[PDB]
Amino acid sequence: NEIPKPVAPAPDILRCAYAELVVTDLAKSRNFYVDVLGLHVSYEDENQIYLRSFEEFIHHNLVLTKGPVAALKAMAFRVRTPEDVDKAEAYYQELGCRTERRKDGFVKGIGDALRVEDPLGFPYEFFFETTHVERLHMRYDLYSAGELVRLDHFNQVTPDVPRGRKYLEDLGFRVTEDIQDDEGTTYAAWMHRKGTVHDTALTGGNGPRLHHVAFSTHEKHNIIQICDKMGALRISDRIERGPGRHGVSNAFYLFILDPDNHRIEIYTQDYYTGDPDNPTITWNVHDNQRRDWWGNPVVPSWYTEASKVLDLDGNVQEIIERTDDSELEVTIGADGFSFTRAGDEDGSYHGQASKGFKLG
Template sequence: MLPKTQLNPPFNITRASHVSLTVTDLGASRDFYRDVIGLVVTEETADTVYFRGLEESVHHSLTLYKTDGAPLADQVGFRVQTDDDIDRAAAYFASIGIEHRRVDKPYQGPTLQFVDPVGTHIELTSSMDVVERKMQNYNEFKAGAPQRIDHFQIVTHDVQKATDFYHTLGYRLSEYTAKDNTDELWGTWMEVKGNTHDLVFTNGRGPRLHHFAYTVPDASALIHAADVAGAYGLGHEIDRGPGRHGISNALFLYVRDPDQHRIELFNTHYQFIDLETPPIRWDVSNPKRAQLWGMPASARWFFEASEFADQPVEEPLLAATPDTLEQYLQLH
């Protein structure tokens, strides 16, 4: 069932903002995101590395923490408009029984962490320290030259529950997948900033972080990122692409880091601003929804993702058997 957008949410979320991961080899992961992906290292300590995109004026959009345990997704971050929105978020979550806590995070203003109804670990902040934009420092563009963080995709056991919750917070449905001429939700693409998505939920074992995504300047940047990965001997870590999604119409490249966290580089989102524009429906049987050029993704793209700490993974309510690249090659 399609949810109704809340035009007067309890607090104001403005965009996808930042993500944090734990990694087993901080040096190797730093080198990957700096040299293979092309992010800017803002700051580095013995146990933490902060990155940002070339266009970004905030201190970080990706944080890596050294761990002696398993590599995990830590927090998925969104910006709210003002400090008052942090207070309003805390009051709202208390009123509906959502687990939450205020935390002090370096380089961030007031910050609130909560666990959403499907188990995703979410962090809200109202501000960050301001640093230099490098979007015209073309001499510093490396690999894919990521410009800014754009969105997150979460694998969840209950797409409907996740979608209903975020619509109460002001997210708006731009595209969705369903089956057999129904509106039973298998995947939802939701936005708050006016392009096709800030947050995606897809059906599967969850909660797990499927990927986080950065914009790149153009199609040639995707090709160059793939070339750089190959030159470093990491062609096998290209998880999918280059290709073009049917959903969102974006060109894409997915790459796995040394701990198998997945990052997407992409471009060419369209605007989704006017309220009278209906969401686009894709049937789950249509392979063009995920790959407009026709080739399916590998099994690991469908079934592997990063778990959250101390968060049980649940089996999906909807049983799916996606067509994979391996199956396609066997048939052809």
């Protein structure tokens, strides 16, 4: 059931800007995002913590909101002009989606804002107005050995990747890389507005669920330091996967888990995608260098676990099961297959993960 291209013009989206995550214990979440990861507090009270990255000048990149059920409440994109908020509302209304408009914002430090239940069930926000804060980009007196410098992207789990992809393309996102097989299945797509590999991404699976939110560092040693610090804090069990080099995106990466199991990616040194004919890279799902370039196996939780998302009433969205083939199953499952070199039996894996492991 293809999502039609509206007649109404798409809003001009600049970039991913922030996520609002509902968390169950505000103090525990603060310990993770401020004490462990070093994000900078823009505002806080007994109910919410507003955080930003080192180089950010808008009010925040992450809002932690206390609530009964941990979930993504909104993933927010900044648009180019005030008028683009109106455009977003018209566009989503033409799509038959539920929308909510608040002239003075949903969260502090954001002004006129539109939230929508998008066609894939995700809570998106579009805004232009935001309170500017001290840009900390040269505050080396504050700089952490693991400093998170920008918000980079979101990654969403959705059962039908082509359907979602076409809709995001009409919205103005361009696909930079994807993962497909030779039987017409798409397992994942990455798409951008700001000229990096992505602002959001679609990962095939039961959904809507939020896979992760990604922050960047300046250098690879910064990511190493986050791992090292987690070991010193004896929370290495909260390192889910990595560190590694991605095939898709070519970024150096790490995946960690917050106190409510919300997955955070730390990411650095992908490439420029701003030209409109940027070459789209398609990896085969059985290429064992596509997710980790070094061939390290992808732990099953990375495929199966992701966060709930909320509707505009704050209720959890029903999960719709994926019927397309599962990346987990076709790569590391019982009938799975992966290769190191296409066409070479040597360095290939049948019914198990790479590097001597099987599914727990």
